[PDB]
Structure 1
Amino acid sequence: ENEHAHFQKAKERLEAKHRERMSQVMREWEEAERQAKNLPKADKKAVIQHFQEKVESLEQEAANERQQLVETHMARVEAMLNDRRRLALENYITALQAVPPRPRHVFNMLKKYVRAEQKDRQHTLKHFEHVRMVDPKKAAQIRSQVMTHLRVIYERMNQSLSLLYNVPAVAEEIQDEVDELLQKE
């Protein structure tokens, strides 16, 4: 339901709100520092302390909102992508069992299944690329789970396309259309 694009608007909102809250605190700190000139040293020290804690507290609030936004989006996108792929695969397997065989209908059901696998692959690569850009240490930690995910997608898609060559009549008829679809994937 364009779930990744809803995550980008939410990500942008979060960021503008953080920038707004931060500039507000910097403004308040200027007013306070100015006012603390006429006060004793203990008040000058406390203003510095209250404002350092306020900026640190804001940094932590933003970090927590980011983390929770990424987690909620990853879980939502994975459930959605799994459901589309479960359905597109079930259809493709149903199309393969038609008597007499229906090659054009098998290809139509395969295209939708390959693309569903492709979206899962693409979105996994998009999320890992983000982590690599923003947090190399977290990326190095998740790299093996990501590559494992990519291995599952790739292997399952190959086990699936193999079923097509298992019905030689259908395969010989659509071998040109499948390879013209695979090279562009």
Structure 2
Amino acid sequence: TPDAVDKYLETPGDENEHAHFQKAKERLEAKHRERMSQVMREWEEAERQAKNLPKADKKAVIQHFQEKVESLEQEAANERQQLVETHMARVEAMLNDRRRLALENYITALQAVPPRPRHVFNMLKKYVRAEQKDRQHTLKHFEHVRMVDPKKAAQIRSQVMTHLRVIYERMNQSLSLLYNVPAVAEEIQDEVDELL
């Protein structure tokens, strides 16, 4: 019952996550090797048997396993891609809260009446950092559309490239925040471009 994928998909948010993901891929792959060998041994028994038969039957037999194999190897390719895509999403969620928490701070510092320039930066590097870690991870996801099957792969790529463009704009929007507090801007500026 609790299938490798079923389990993973049912125990989310996890703090240990990465473990689940590896335990997941490692456990699914194992089982796969099982069924795969079960079908391959099976295929032989079928050949040796039907051997003293017509080309029509021998051949037809081969067209059975050839197809049962293509059938499982596919479902298998999908279960994996199921794991990756879920995981990939759960990390995104994490990285996103981090992006959020750093910004709620950068805004916190930005608003202090005696705008301690030194602080703005402190809280901003943490924002720009997270944003960057997200930038990076979104890319990792893009590249993980390797098994590219339907147009789902092209659809995802578009969803990835799309969020990738947001990440940027939303940071530049966050950076435009300095203009409203035209002061800390100078003490921070030249330093800002350095991080960039």
For the aligned residue pairs, the C-alpha RMSD in angstroms reads 3.3
Please report the TM-score for the alignment, with normalisation by the length of structure 1. Answer: 0.76
Inter-partner Cα distance in structure 2 for 1:156 and 1:4: 28
1:78-107 Cα offsets, whole Å, 9 max, x none, are 322221112111111011111212222211
Query: Is the contact between residue 141 and residue 160 of structure 2 (CA under 8 Å) also seen in structure 1?
Result: no
- Give the aligned partner of residue 18 of structure 1: 32
Cα distance change of structure 1 residues 139 and 71 upon mapping to structure 2, 3 Å threshold: closer
After the TM superposition, which of the residue ranges 140-149 and 2-11 deviates more from structure 2? 2-11
Counterpart of 2:46 in 1: which secondary structure?
A: helix
Query: Is the contact between residue 124 and residue 146 of structure 1 (CA under 8 Å) also seen in structure 2?
Result: yes
Cα distance change of structure 1 residues 105 and 113 upon mapping to structure 2, 3 Å threshold: same
The match for 2:191 among 169, 177, 180 is 177
- Give the aligned partner of residue 89 of structure 1: 103
Inter-partner Cα distance in structure 2 for 1:68 and 1:132: 12
Query: Is the contact between residue 85 and residue 113 of structure 1 (CA under 8 Å) also seen in structure 2?
Result: yes
1:16-55 Cα offsets, whole Å, 9 max, x none, are 6545543443233223312333568787466435423431
The unaligned stretches of length 5 or more in structure 2 are 1-14
The unaligned stretches of length 5 or more in structure 1 are none
Inter-partner Cα distance in structure 1 for 2:193 and 2:86: 37
How far residue 65 of structure 1 moved from its aligned partner, in angstroms, is: 0.3
Inter-partner Cα distance in structure 2 for 1:24 and 1:3: 32
After the TM superposition, which of the residue ranges 135-144 and 149-158 deviates more from structure 2? 135-144
Query: Is the contact between residue 145 and residue 157 of structure 2 (CA under 8 Å) also seen in structure 1?
Result: no
Query: Is the contact between residue 77 and residue 147 of structure 2 (CA under 8 Å) also seen in structure 1?
Result: no
Counterpart of 1:134 in 2: which secondary structure?
A: coil
Query: Is the contact between residue 32 and residue 47 of structure 1 (CA under 8 Å) also seen in structure 2?
Result: yes
Cα distance change of structure 1 residues 6 and 180 upon mapping to structure 2, 3 Å threshold: farther
Inter-partner Cα distance in structure 1 for 2:49 and 2:126: 66
Cα distance change of structure 1 residues 135 and 84 upon mapping to structure 2, 3 Å threshold: same
The match for 1:73 among 80, 84, 87 is 87
Inter-partner Cα distance in structure 1 for 2:71 and 2:154: 27
Cα distance change of structure 1 residues 7 and 97 upon mapping to structure 2, 3 Å threshold: same
Query: Is the contact between residue 96 and residue 106 of structure 1 (CA under 8 Å) also seen in structure 2?
Result: yes
After the TM superposition, which of the residue ranges 136-145 and 110-119 deviates more from structure 2? 136-145
